[PDB]
Design a binder for these strands. Structure first.
Lengths: 93, 73
DNA sequence: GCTTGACAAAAGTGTTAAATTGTGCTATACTGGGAGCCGTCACGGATGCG
């Protein structure tokens, strides 16, 4: 039973994370693209040594560099409006 | 009372980053084949660099240099 | 001043093709987490352990 149950458990966990891990909800079809981009970038960083450029990633993913830039823009995470800018418990963002 | 110099402060963050890296290595170690497995596949360098960057840019000890005059610096 | 008339130029609908998105599924075996924890310092007052 464990062999079949593991697939479904992993699927449910990943889907729930995709649907509920961000304040601004991104559909699953975009989360998949973002994860693919991240994995490709991580793989490239090891062998290239430098920071991969947008064009190389775009070619490796068979998409235009503008699409890579758009995906990166979508990857932004909102920041908390209650920070400690001031180095003291005096002022927030 | 002892003194933590810059070297020790950086060493602590390196230790934390390597601990996170080791946790990731443990997670990945028992998930793929044992024959065609190489250090590159299961070694993720992101946590250590992330810790190093966080310390320099966020730690209260790492401070914006005072450049009013040579004596200040 | 006040109309009529002949025409481009935009405001509106119809229908398709396309892009986006919401669900479902994948069969070796896998079966209890991990961050802890750092000099006030005094003051009352409630709690709970024996």
């Amino acid at each position: 039973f464990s062999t079949y149950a593991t697939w479904w458990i992993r699927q449910a966990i990943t889907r729930a994370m995709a649907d509920q891990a961000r304040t601004i909800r991104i559909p699953v079809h975009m989360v998949e693209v973002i994860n693919k981009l991240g994995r490709i970038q991580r793989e490239l960083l090891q062998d290239l040594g430098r920071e991969p450029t947008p064009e190389e990633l775009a070619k490796e993913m068979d998409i235009t560099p503008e699409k890579v830039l758009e995906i990166q823009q979508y990857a932004r995470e909102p920041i908390s409006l209650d920070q400690t800018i001031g180095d003291e418990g005096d002022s927030q963002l | 009372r002892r003194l933590r110099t810059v070297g020790e402060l950086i060493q602590n963050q390196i230790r934390v980053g390597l601990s996170r890296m080791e946790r990731v290595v443990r997670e990945r170690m028992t998930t793929q084949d044992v024959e065609a497995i190489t250090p590159q596949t299961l070694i993720n360098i992101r946590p250590v660099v992330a810790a190093i960057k966080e310390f320099f840019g966020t730690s209260q000890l790492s401070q914006f240099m005072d450049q009013n005059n040579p004596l200040s610096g």
